Design a protein around this ligand. Structure first.
Ligand SMILES: NC(=[NH2+])c1ccc2nc(C(=O)c3nc4ccc(C(N)=[NH2+])cc4[nH]3)[nH]c2c1
Ligand SMILES: [Ca+2]
Ligand SMILES: [Mg+2]
Ligand SMILES: [Zn+2]
Length: 223
């Protein structure tokens, strides 16, 4: 996250860190046994870490659980990144508490203007590499599809939306991937892609989760 602030230990209790010997992507807990992340975060051998704040220190509120199965969206295109969402089932169900809680899926899609909270342990420098050990947060509004499509001509589909600042300075970045974009209490986006990070007129692009609620509900109930 570039231009964000330290969230505070466990203030985003539904944030997960996907680890395959190191942190490589973020994710969101949707219920005690399932996590939603981005399909471009697919790997084999993933351990889900809940209750994290500093990912380099065991501070006492973590739960490390391995995944039993991963389901990448049936129509995910790795070249355009369209339908960039994946579900992960935990081998055991998490124990939910104040520090580990699930986030709610949306009943409708959010409007341009809506302020959201985006979080992750991704790169914090636009020009450079600096990876934080504690969770970083960023409040950014959803942008109109028009400014999103002008920034990325012929690349934005109906399954994506942009959020951020066209002036640049604030954005999600690699390492935040798969992470949550919560607006009004509902998980509305998943960190998917962008042009570098925090560049002027290059906002972040997120997966539009309101378009996948039936696929999510049907998939977890049948797995
Ligand atoms: N399994 C891997 N090897 C892997 C995992 C995540 C990656 N992520 C990128 C990436 O290239 C990438 N993830 C981004 C997320 C947000 C923005 C943004 N500017 N908002 C830009 C991003 N670029 N490469 C990746 C490779
Ligand atoms: Ca830790
Ligand atoms: Mg994240
Ligand atoms: Zn990524």
């Amino acid at each position: 996250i570039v231009g964000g602030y330290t969230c505070g230990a466990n203030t985003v209790p539904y944030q997960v860190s996907l680890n395959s010997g190191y942190h490589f992507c973020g994710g969101s807990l949707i219920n005690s046994q399932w996590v939603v992340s981005a399909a471009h975060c697919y790997k084999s051998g993933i351990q889900v870490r809940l209750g994290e704040d500093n990912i380099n220190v065991v501070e006492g509120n973590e739960q490390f659980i391995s995944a039993s199965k991963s389901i990448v969206h049936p129509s995910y295109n790795s070249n355009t990144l369209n339908n960039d969402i994946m579900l992960i089932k935990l081998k055991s169900a998490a124990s939910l508490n104040s520090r580990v809680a699930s986030i709610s899926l949306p009943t409708s899609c959010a409007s341009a203007g809506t302020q959201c909270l985006i979080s992750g342990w991704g790169n914090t420098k636009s020009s450079g590499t600096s990876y934080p050990d504690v969770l970083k947060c960023l409040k950014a509004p959803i942008l109109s599809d028009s400014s999103c499509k002008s920034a990325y001509p012929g690349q934005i589909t109906s399954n994506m939306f942009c959020a951020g600042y066209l002036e640049g300075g604030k954005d999600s970045c690699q390492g935040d991937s798969g992470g949550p974009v919560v607006c009004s209490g509902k998980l509305q986006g998943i960190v998917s892609w962008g042009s570098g990070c925090a560049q002027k007129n290059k906002p972040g692009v997120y997966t539009k989760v309101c378009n996948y609620v039936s696929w999510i509900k049907q998939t977890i109930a049948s797995n």
